Structure 1
Amino acid sequence: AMRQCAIYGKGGIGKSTTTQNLVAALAEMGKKVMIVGCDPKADSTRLILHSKAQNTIMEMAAEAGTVEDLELEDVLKAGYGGVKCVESGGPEPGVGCAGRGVITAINFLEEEGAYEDDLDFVFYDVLGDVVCGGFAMPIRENKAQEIYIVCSGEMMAMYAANNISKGIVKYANSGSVRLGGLICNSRNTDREDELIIALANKLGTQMIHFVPRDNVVQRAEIRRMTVIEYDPKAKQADEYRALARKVVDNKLLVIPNPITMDELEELLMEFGIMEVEDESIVG
């Protein structure tokens, strides 16, 4: 058995930091994991590979001739803890469809035997600002059974969580794609944990973890590492281990109940997210 998981969320919310650190914690436990980058930014594997980024399937297929000229052992690279890494890539801005590379990448990995019996987890790191084309494919074509949405007390982050949830509902007649949880990636905003717990309850899921805002992330990433590798004794390393334990143990996988913009606005007004005038901890 393997668990196919996808990390969705708006741009800049912390999908790649969260996914690579969660996966580093799973590898540290002895789990075998593959990360599939499904974001055109294509830096979803750099902290596992100690790299600038990784050459994408779209880029390499173009150099080799066709995608059928590529070998698995060429798009798939191992880094920290033997975690296997691949990047979809996508077309340059203003050309075709930004998500087209995800379709090509996932089909290539399936055909070429990437999904080896002894993988415990696969994580897709997926752009979530639009739910269409290749970005919808993991949900529409039943590739990721467990969706975890990284969000914050930001209206845009919660709107994106609600939109991804609407996509999961749309495809619930087919396949087994479910919402597994919200991950609150802290803005250092007051009552933000309570806000995302409230949003998770309205959607019918849970807040699986509150990830603190910790500068050790910046210090680790300047050195192209996860916090797990950079400073395994950091408080933030234990935060990612807590997230990893709760993902491993999670059994709540639901068809979510998307909410209205009225409900989103009421949540923000309720937890005083818009009336606050400073961070919880200053500094």
Structure 2
Amino acid sequence: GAKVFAVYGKGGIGKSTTSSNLSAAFSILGKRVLQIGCDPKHDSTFTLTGSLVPTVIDVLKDVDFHPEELRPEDFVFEGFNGVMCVEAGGPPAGTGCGGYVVGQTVKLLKQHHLLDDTDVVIFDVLGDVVCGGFAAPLQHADQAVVVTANDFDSIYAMNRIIAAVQAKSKNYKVRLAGCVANRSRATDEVDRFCKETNFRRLAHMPDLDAIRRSRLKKKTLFEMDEDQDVLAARAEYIRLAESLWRGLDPIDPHSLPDRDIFELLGFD
């Protein structure tokens, strides 16, 4: 069966960058990949297709919320190097639960057996809250990965996401793999946090010109025109993908009481 990953973190921290470049890396390693955007900011798969594909909510609206009329070709799109792409989108105005479209997406994935017949599945998920449809990927994932920077807000979110994932531990198989420290020069604060919680930093991606430009060219680092700066960034994504494919030794971390994050990071 597929190895399934769920990527969480605060808004704007690099979830889609990390997910898309990981999907591209896995494809380069010879794996069949499916990436599912689970975020009301519906550009998860943008750099894989070079476009904003029709979203699950778009196509649901088109069949007047009779999802039984949909076929995979309506909402699953081929992107870079054969990476398959689904984009949930966000719920329309007034919608009760903010996760509803992610819930509808995960329903369709299971009904169409789309987690089968592939090697790697990556869910790219809003993590400012983890509940309802935003928690649905956890029922399917083997490993959860948190994207973080060194700032207070991203670490505080990471701590809450750790708690959310561990709260599922008796019901789901998903376990935490660790974090990707992203868009920062070094990792002092992330490492301080990891030491306190026995958590693991899986990778460090600096704030790279190559990456910012890739999004502006509507491409992944791997689809980009070759230059030197691209090569180093590519290598770290390949390394990270290799480690996740191979599997890591387990961690058994803990979340801190939320109050104690303020203390730990000098913000009380």
Q: Which residue of 1 aligns with 2:124?
A: 125
Q: Which residue of 1 aligns with 2:111?
A: 111
Does 1:184 find its partner at 2:178?
A: no
1:146-165 paired onto structure 2 within 5 Å:
146-165=143-162
- 3-state DSSP class of the match of 1:110? helix
How far residue 242 of structure 1 moved from its aligned partner, in angstroms, is 2.2
Does 1:6 find its partner at 2:11?
A: no
Q: Which residue of 1 aligns with 2:195?
A: 201
Cα distance in 1, alignment partners of residues 76 and 113 from structure 2? 11
Counterpart code for 1:238: A
Report if the CA contact (8 A) 2:200-2:251 is conserved: no
How far residue 217 of structure 1 moved from its aligned partner, in angstroms, is 1.3
Question: Which sits farther off after the overlay, 129-138 or 246-255?
Answer: 246-255
Question: Which sits farther off after the overlay, 252-261 or 165-174?
Answer: 252-261
1:46-69 residue CA offsets vs partner (Å, 9 max, x unmatched): 111011x11111210220231111
Does 1:210 find its partner at 2:204?
A: yes
1:168-193 residue CA offsets vs partner (Å, 9 max, x unmatched): 121111121211111000333xxx42
Report if the CA contact (8 A) 2:2-2:116 is conserved: no
Counterpart code for 1:145: D
How far residue 243 of structure 1 moved from its aligned partner, in angstroms, is 2.1
Q: Which residue of 2 aligns with 1:144?
A: 141
1:236-255 paired onto structure 2 within 5 Å:
236-255=233-252
1:6-155 paired onto structure 2 within 5 Å:
6-51=6-51, 53-65=52-64, 66-117=66-117, 119-139=118-138, 142-155=139-152
1:137-162 residue CA offsets vs partner (Å, 9 max, x unmatched): 222xx211200000011111011111
RMSD: 1.8
The 3 A distance-change label for structure 1 pair 218 and 33 is: same
- 3-state DSSP class of the match of 2:34? strand
Gaps in structure 2 of 5+ consecutive residues = none
Question: Aligned to 1:225, which of 185, 206, 219?
Answer: 219
- 3-state DSSP class of the match of 1:55? coil
How far residue 218 of structure 1 moved from its aligned partner, in angstroms, is 2.0
Cα distance in 2, alignment partners of residues 265 and 232 from structure 1? 43
1:79-130 residue CA offsets vs partner (Å, 9 max, x unmatched): 111000001122135432221011111111111121233x111000000001
Q: Which residue of 2 aligns with 1:279?
A: none
State how many pairs are aligned: 263
How far residue 199 of structure 1 moved from its aligned partner, in angstroms, is 2.0
Gaps in structure 1 of 5+ consecutive residues = 275-283
Cα distance in 2, alignment partners of residues 267 and 247 from structure 1? 29
The 3 A distance-change label for structure 1 pair 137 and 254 is: farther
Counterpart code for 1:239: E
Counterpart code for 2:44: S
Report if the CA contact (8 A) 1:56-1:75 is conserved: yes
How far residue 256 of structure 1 moved from its aligned partner, in angstroms, is 3.2
